[PDB]
Amino acid sequence: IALSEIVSVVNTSDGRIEVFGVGTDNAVWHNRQTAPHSGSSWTGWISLNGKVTSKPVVYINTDGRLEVFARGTDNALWHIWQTATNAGWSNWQSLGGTITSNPAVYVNTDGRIDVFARGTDNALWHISQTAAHSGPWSSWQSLNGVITSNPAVHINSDGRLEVFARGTDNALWHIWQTAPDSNQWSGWDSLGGVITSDPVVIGTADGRLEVFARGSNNALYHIWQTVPHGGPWSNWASLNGVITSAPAVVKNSDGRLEVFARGTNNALYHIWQTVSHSGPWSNWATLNGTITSAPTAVEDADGRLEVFARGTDNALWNIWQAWSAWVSLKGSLIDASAIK
Amino acid sequence: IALSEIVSVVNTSDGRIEVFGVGTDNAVWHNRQTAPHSGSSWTGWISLNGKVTSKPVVYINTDGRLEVFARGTDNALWHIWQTATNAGWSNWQSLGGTITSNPAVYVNTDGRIDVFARGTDNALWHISQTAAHSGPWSSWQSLNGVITSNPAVHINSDGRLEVFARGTDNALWHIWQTAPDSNQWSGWDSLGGVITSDPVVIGTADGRLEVFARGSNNALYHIWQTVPHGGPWSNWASLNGVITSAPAVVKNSDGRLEVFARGTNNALYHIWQTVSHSGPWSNWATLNGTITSAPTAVEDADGRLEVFARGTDNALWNIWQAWSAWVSLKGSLIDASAI
Ligand SMILES: COC[C@H]1O[C@@H](O)[C@H](O)[C@@H](OC)[C@@H]1O
Ligand SMILES: COC[C@H]1O[C@@H](O)[C@H](O)[C@@H](OC)[C@@H]1O
Ligand SMILES: COC[C@H]1O[C@@H](O)[C@H](O)[C@@H](OC)[C@@H]1O
Ligand SMILES: COC[C@H]1O[C@@H](O)[C@H](O)[C@@H](OC)[C@@H]1O
Ligand code: NA
Ligand code: NA
Ligand code: NA
Ligand code: NA
Ligand code: NA
């Protein structure tokens, strides 16, 4: 597995970006833009405490309250939630299980959060809120499979969750809800290829899933649904470069996908669709810096891409599609990824 | 009440704009882009049948199935829905009641559609799916009040629905859910002013409701939440101009609000925030054309505002933000607004 993300990032309900990372104390810390604009100053680092052995995953409930999921020191799944939107936080609470990956989080069409994780059998497990943005939580259930990467989850344009994972053959496998909100899932299906990173999945402007991954010659590769919310999938295509991290993918305000990755010089590179969505790809460009994690991208309230990465000082650095100069948000972050 | 929207518009689950309006036959017709791009070609008008006496209101379910709400000839609320995402249509079904307004439709945080309509007692009534994107429907419930306009509905940035309406005083009133997904509503509250259009409400890029209405001098006024998801509201402010339609508001790809309205010369006028979201407003500017309806606005998949309006030929016309040539989508539409 290629070097992974160190921070989770989300757009709050009031348009401020909020980053979550693991500290040197193995607590979860969070930083928040003071105002909803590109190159806004930040609140400074605030601790949620806890003791975590994975990447924390933040997700926004459908009522605007942030929720963070992480593997505890017992290797169970823990979580913690805002008690009101953008306000105070609950105590940490255990969802049990034993997980050997980073969680992957998405919300069902009925506002119920689903969490996915590799188990000790290397099978993919899930647990869900049994009501909209609310406990109590279901029991753990297995979707079987044998996965050698962290899972990645997105929703189909028809409301069916779809999970992607590397298998024991190192091809990309994937599995889908049979209906929206359903505990009934499809068989595992191979999309072939050779993947040397966690897959990252995004929905295109035209409702098609597109998956990106590092492949065998350290080039970036992608594969996409050829029609909305179904097969057949395209063949693998190459975007070249030589990368040394997982890719981070995001949509510009006009629908054009942009991909960010660490290069061989440990600088941040990017490549974007030109003209429009489902248009041709540019050549790679450098944004410089020196990074010790995969980048993480998100779109701010202004429609500008913002990218976050750990530096050599183990602080979090930001750059925005102004691109701007690199700036430090300070702090001291660790790579607690369950699968390295 | 200022001349209403003639079409309802949605960006479908595959980035294709789809238009719903009433034809000369009093059926609901729909037109859909063939490709998810600005100035794409259109499928041509397909009928969903029915006989309607309101503007039809379309909403995307959480699973991507369009659903359409319209007053029937019996003055009941009727609906028809896609059986699969961007695929075949059900038959019309009645949700009953007796309504004296255009419906207004939003989705709760649990994926249950809520529908709002004036009743025969001039009160605000509502009815809801009892599960995510599915029947059965709840029974009609009153939120009381006395309203002399079509309600407008939006969700707060904390998951609480909020409904806006002109009262008997011609002032902007509103009422809100107490908790996300709740049947327990606040009391009615007045934001004051004097308005001669239906109110139009949008969520800003920073989680604040802003409401737009035509004032008694036929100028454009707006008022806003001063903090995310609650009071106090600001004072009314004018953006001046003279408008002869309901204004339509939409958020640009970068969060800058933009308002569209018919002028006294029956042309399309627009005004926009400059620099950033919550920047200062531009000056009014024309896009020419001659329209016999209020304009409707929507962001397409390329991030460009598209505007729809009936012309003097009663065909639906489309202009988009490059701006483009006016383009006829053809057909023959009627202003069926219940008010
Ligand atoms: C996510 O934080 C969970 C941790 O909460 C801590 O407060 C507990 O001491 C510790 O158990 C010894 C858990 O792993
Ligand atoms: C010395 O750096 C080699 C880089 O060469 C660049 O031309 C590639 O695009 C880039 O891959 C994204 C490589 O890392
Ligand atoms: C949406 O169309 C509703 C109308 O459908 C018609 O087909 C019904 O016969 C008629 O019943 C009076 C309804 O008003
Ligand atoms: C939305 O109400 C705006 C009203 O604001 C008042 O301040 C104006 O005097 C009045 O114009 C005579 C407007 O209608
Ligand atoms: Na990162
Ligand atoms: Na939720
Ligand atoms: Na779902
Ligand atoms: Na990785
Ligand atoms: Na709600």
Please, could you describe this protein's structure?
Two copies of one chain form a homodimer. Chain A is mainly beta. Chain A has a single domain (8-330), classed as Neuraminidase (6 Propeller), CATH 2.120.10. In chain A, 0% of the residues lie in helices and 41% in strands. Chain A is built from no helices and 30 strands. In chain A, strands 9, 10, 11, 12 and 13 form a five-stranded antiparallel beta sheet that branches. In chain A, strands 18, 19, 20, 21 and 22 form a five-stranded antiparallel beta sheet that branches. A four-stranded antiparallel beta sheet of chain A has the order 1-2-3-4, with no helix packed on it. In chain A, strand 15 (161-166) and strand 16 form a beta hairpin. The interface between A and B is large, with 43 and 42 residues. One sodium ion binds next to loops of chain A.
